[PDB]
Design a protein around this ligand. Structure first.
Ligand SMILES: [Mg+2]
Ligand SMILES: [Mg+2]
Ligand SMILES: [Mg+2]
Ligand SMILES: [Mg+2]
Ligand SMILES: [Mg+2]
Ligand SMILES: [Mg+2]
Ligand SMILES: [Mg+2]
Ligand SMILES: [Mg+2]
Ligand SMILES: [Mg+2]
Ligand SMILES: [Mg+2]
Ligand SMILES: [Mg+2]
Ligand SMILES: [Mg+2]
Ligand SMILES: [Mg+2]
Ligand SMILES: [Mg+2]
Ligand SMILES: [Mg+2]
Ligand SMILES: [Mg+2]
Ligand SMILES: [Mg+2]
Ligand SMILES: [Mg+2]
Ligand SMILES: [Mg+2]
Ligand SMILES: [Mg+2]
Ligand SMILES: [Mg+2]
Ligand SMILES: [Mg+2]
Ligand SMILES: [Mg+2]
Ligand SMILES: [Mg+2]
Ligand SMILES: [Mg+2]
Ligand SMILES: [Mg+2]
Ligand SMILES: [Mg+2]
Ligand SMILES: [Mg+2]
Ligand SMILES: [Mg+2]
Ligand SMILES: [Mg+2]
Ligand SMILES: [Mg+2]
Ligand SMILES: [Mg+2]
Ligand SMILES: [Mg+2]
Ligand SMILES: [Mg+2]
Ligand SMILES: [Mg+2]
Ligand SMILES: [Mg+2]
Ligand SMILES: [Mg+2]
Ligand SMILES: [Mg+2]
Ligand SMILES: [Mg+2]
Ligand SMILES: [Mg+2]
Ligand SMILES: [Mg+2]
Ligand SMILES: [Mg+2]
Ligand SMILES: [Mg+2]
Ligand SMILES: [Zn+2]
Lengths: 119, 50, 85, 60, 101
RNA sequence: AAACUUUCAACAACGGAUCUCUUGGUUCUCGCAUCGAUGAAGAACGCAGCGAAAUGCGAUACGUAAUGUGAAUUGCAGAAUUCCGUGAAUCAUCGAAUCUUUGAACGCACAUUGCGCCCCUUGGUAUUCCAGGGGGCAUGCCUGUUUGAGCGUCAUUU
RNA sequence: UUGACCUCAAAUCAGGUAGGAGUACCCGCUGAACUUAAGCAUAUCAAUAAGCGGAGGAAAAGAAACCAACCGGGAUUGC
RNA sequence: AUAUUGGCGAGAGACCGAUAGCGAACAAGUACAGUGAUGGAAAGAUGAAAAGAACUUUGAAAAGAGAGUGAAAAAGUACGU
RNA sequence: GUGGAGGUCAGUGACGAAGCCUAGACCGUAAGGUCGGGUCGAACGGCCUCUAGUGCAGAUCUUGGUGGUAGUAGCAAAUAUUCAAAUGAGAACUUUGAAGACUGAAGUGGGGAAAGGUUCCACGUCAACAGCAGUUGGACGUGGGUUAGUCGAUCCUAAGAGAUGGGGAAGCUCCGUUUCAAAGGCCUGAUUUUAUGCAGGCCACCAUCGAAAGGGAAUCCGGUUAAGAUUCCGGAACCUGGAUAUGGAUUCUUCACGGUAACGUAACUGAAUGUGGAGACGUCGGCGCGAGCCCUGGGAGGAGUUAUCUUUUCUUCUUAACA
RNA sequence: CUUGUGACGGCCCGUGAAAAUCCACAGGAAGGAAUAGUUUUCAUGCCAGGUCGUACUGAUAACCGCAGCAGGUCUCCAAGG
């Protein structure tokens, strides 16, 4: 059982918030009934449903922030790339490709020609 | 030490939970090689040294 | 009576738990751990202690974050998500 | 009597009980059980009955 | 051979002086404008025994000429100085017992 | 003559040798370059219906989201619509997240679950007191902004 | 009086950046002794072990203030 | 072009075969000792499948004697030989 | 003769390979080889060559296991146990009753600090431990239990430790704790576009850590649990911090009066700054005073002895913090 | 008898901690009344007081002496003859 992720994504934040506070309610009363019956595996689906809603709530919030910071430098660090420490510090392909005027003229004038040795 | 720090009392709780025999349903799983709780401790023979 | 009678007077922990390694080797008076070198920034380690390095080297723990870096590298550190092929 | 998260203090416990159960709290006593959990002793005002609240929660 | 005793004192592990009960460093009043141009007056308040010192201390109270405070000095008591005695320190002080000419 | 000792054989003991297996190790060869202040390695404590350990994970806690596969898991119970399907699985993959207290560890400390300060907000008849929620306050150094200090020093005055 | 310059500070000032781990290989510093010499001090073990600082998938070196003495060769690296 | 007892991914051996081979084929850097730096094990094999002995009887009970499963209880969780 | 490798005997083998036992047999001088018989259940051999971690009685050899000694040495300090009943299959050791004893208040009592860590208490339970025993347990299995504005920590500083500014050291790090520092907040008022910069003024230690016996704000009594209490319940208090309203006080001589005086009261403005006090203190001897305990009279209740005597012997009659 | 306390006396070439914290005084900046003020060291009146330890032994058995070892381990209360 439990709530599925895809149909939650069609909701809004207030509906999700109402869903969450409702979800936390039964987990309370399932927990008090857990000590009554010898076993109750139904609580597992309840807790997972809370996680699914919480992920959905977070997912919507970040995307709206991403749209807010779209198209301008200095985005929040957690929304940046998490490749490595080294790669983030590495030279970008633009700056690595930069070359002085003296060398650019030599490359354009004298590139490595394609030659064949048969005759 | 009746008057003890919370850190020591936190190590207290885990030791209480550790000291418990093997659950019986562990015996019945397929390819079960565990015979008993080998890491059992008792206050008379082994001290925690914490 | 340096033997049994003297052994009875041992009730003062010279060391306690280390905040960094949790070994019960933190010297209370010296305020320095004798195992991991806390509070010094560098972790205590010696090349003559070949066994000692092996006990606390990387791999003996969880690699809470470094487990997946090889998996991430194999995919070339892709970004985004799948597309329901 | 309630089991409470070890990060909660008496202010939060008093705040929460009157929230979920809409019942005023006289005083709160807390202790750490030997198993590592926190146990809260919440005393309700004489205007309210603990037994009536207890089975309303679902245990008695 | 083993390090002999007189060497071992220099490290100052247990050979430092026991200074718990001393009332303070017995120094004269600092040399300022008043003393090198005139004289200043003081009052002997306490004649205290100093721990580890045979001579007694004289505890003289002075007035700060620049701020309204009551700078208190610790002298080494000379034979014949009594409590409540006025003490004169400075270049123009009269030659009397306890003065700091 | 019996008992007893000793020798031998059968059976039975003690003990675990030999024989036969081997998800292990060792050695050699080939390919790749990927840790961390966007918080590493390591530590502590916790999380399952029934778990002590190993493994997994972090109050979203043997896990959530996404994709692929296509009907399970299993010791028991339970759950079934999940079965011609946006769909079982302790499945595989893995790009989105969560990630307790720590730790280079960064408000100050730490043998304490100690003590602070700033902003927004809520309640307590409150800018000052108290409490709750959220976000912050390390060191060195670089570039740039702002405010400055120095008869170090110029010009400009009256 | 006003405005510059130079030097030096302060900002929870706008951006960054360094610290730790691993260390088989790599770049340096520091640095022994056992042992051999049928003893032993120079020597040898050894410009090694331990210790300390610093990177990458390689590092380092690298295009002669070179080798040569020949009819001269021609960065570095390795067999 | 060179190095690499580390890390990741692979292929092999006139290598070793549970007192061997890594200390560790197993909940091994674990249990355990030391105040501490550190030191540091032992421990693999029922059976094809638990089919792990229903039931009767003696005993307070553990168990024994029967009965039974099994190709084999001269395989009975102290289990290959 | 052994482990492994190349080649061959289209070698042996679940109709039983290897291994193990066999005063059963055969061959070789021997190292050894072959067969029969019992157990056994999955691989192994003959020959030509190759290769080695290849042959054990010793090494006070290593690891593991087992003997004689041997049912032996022995289980003898701490004065001491006995009868009956109950549970129980089983009682010298368990429970209860009775009896005899001991510790004898610098205890075998009642609590604590360091340490231990659930040993505390309950239920069931005796396979191993309690060097006999065991129905018992500090054992085994399953659970319960630790409540604080006033008790401690947290706060302060002591001997001491230890950053920063600095200066050494190749470096890990060392020295130093106010030192060759541009080392900050304190309060009042203005502004009510408005939040707080300008108005001012003020001050000079200049991190931090360091005591569960040093210093320190404030709680007592009664009752309750299987196990908690100065923490829980009832009652009665106190301290700190903060918002305040009333009453009281004082004022037209604006910030009170009285007493000669020591001084008294219900209050009875007071910033910067300075001074003082408390915190804050050795040891011994005797003396005075207080509290508790001990002794004892009268009386008010209860119990014991009573062949005889004993207005007798023992016991209850208590009053916290705070005002 | 134990203990607290007061006033004393003896002893020293020994004269027998510091800090946090609280109060008072000196001071007179400032603010203050009459148709109304001033006053929160007087009384009453309201609210809050977080966090962590709290069980038990403390020893011829709960600590260290490999152990249920005649050993060692700081302290409080102490009836009658
Ligand atoms: Mg001692
Ligand atoms: Mg010490
Ligand atoms: Mg508490
Ligand atoms: Mg020699
Ligand atoms: Mg020689
Ligand atoms: Mg020699
Ligand atoms: Mg080295
Ligand atoms: Mg290079
Ligand atoms: Mg170069
Ligand atoms: Mg020991
Ligand atoms: Mg057989
Ligand atoms: Mg068999
Ligand atoms: Mg024989
Ligand atoms: Mg056979
Ligand atoms: Mg088989
Ligand atoms: Mg050999
Ligand atoms: Mg032999
Ligand atoms: Mg021999
Ligand atoms: Mg031998
Ligand atoms: Mg005998
Ligand atoms: Mg004897
Ligand atoms: Mg006494
Ligand atoms: Mg008990
Ligand atoms: Mg026995
Ligand atoms: Mg027995
Ligand atoms: Mg230092
Ligand atoms: Mg402190
Ligand atoms: Mg204290
Ligand atoms: Mg004192
Ligand atoms: Mg009191
Ligand atoms: Mg008690
Ligand atoms: Mg009460
Ligand atoms: Mg009056
Ligand atoms: Mg004083
Ligand atoms: Mg009274
Ligand atoms: Mg006394
Ligand atoms: Mg005296
Ligand atoms: Mg208690
Ligand atoms: Mg208690
Ligand atoms: Mg007790
Ligand atoms: Mg005691
Ligand atoms: Mg005692
Ligand atoms: Mg012990
Ligand atoms: Zn450590």
């Amino acid at each position: 059982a439990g709530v599925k992720a895809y149909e939650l994504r069609t909701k809004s934040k207030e509906q999700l918030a109402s869903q969450l506070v409702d979800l936390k309610k039964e987990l309370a009363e399932l927990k008090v009934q857990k000590l009554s019956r010898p076993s109750l595996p139904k609580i597992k689906t309840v807790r997972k449903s809370i996680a699914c809603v919480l992920t959905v709530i977070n997912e919507q919030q970040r995307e709206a922030v991403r749209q807010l910071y779209k198209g301008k430098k200095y985005q929040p660090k957690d929304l940046r790339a998490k490749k490595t420490r080294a790669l983030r510090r590495a030279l970008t392909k633009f700056e690595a490709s930069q070359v002085t005027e003296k060398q650019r003229k030599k490359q354009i004038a004298f590139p490595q020609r394609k030659y064949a040795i048969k005759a | 030490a009746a008057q003890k720090s919370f850190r020591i009392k936190q190590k207290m709780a885990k030791a209480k939970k550790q000291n418990r025999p093997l659950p019986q349903w562990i015996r019945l799983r397929t390819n079960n090689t565990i015979r008993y709780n080998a890491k059992r401790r008792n206050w008379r023979r082994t001290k925690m040294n914490i | 009576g340096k033997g049994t009678p003297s052994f009875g007077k041992r009730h003062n922990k010279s060391h306690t738990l280390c905040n960094r390694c949790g070994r019960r080797s933190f010297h209370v008076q010296k305020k320095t751990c004798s195992s991991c070198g806390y509070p010094a920034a560098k972790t205590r380690s010696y090349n003559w202690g070949a066994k000692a390095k092996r006990r606390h080297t990387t791999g003996t723990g969880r690699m809470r974050y470094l487990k997946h870096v090889s998996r991430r590298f194999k995919n070339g550190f892709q970004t985004g998500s799948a597309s329901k092929a | 009597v309630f089991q409470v998260s070890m990060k909660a203090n008496k202010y939060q416990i008093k705040k929460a009980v009157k929230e979920l159960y809409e019942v005023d709290v006289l005083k709160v006593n807390t202790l750490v059980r030997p198993n590592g959990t926190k146990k809260a002793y919440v005393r309700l005002t004489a205007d309210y009955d603990a037994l009536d609240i207890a089975n309303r929660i679902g245990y008695i | 051979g083993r390090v002999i005793r007189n060497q071992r004192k220099g490290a100052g592990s247990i050979f430092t002086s026991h200074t718990r009960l001393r009332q303070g460093a017995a120094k004269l009043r600092t040399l300022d404008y008043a003393e090198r141009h005139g004289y200043i007056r003081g009052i002997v308040k306490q004649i205290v025994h100093d721990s580890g010192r045979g001579a007694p201390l004289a505890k003289v109270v002075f007035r700060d000429p620049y701020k309204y405070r009551l700078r208190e000095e610790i002298f080494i008591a000379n034979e014949g100085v009594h409590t409540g005695q006025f003490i004169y320190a400075g270049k123009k002080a009269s030659l009397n017992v306890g003065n700091v000419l």
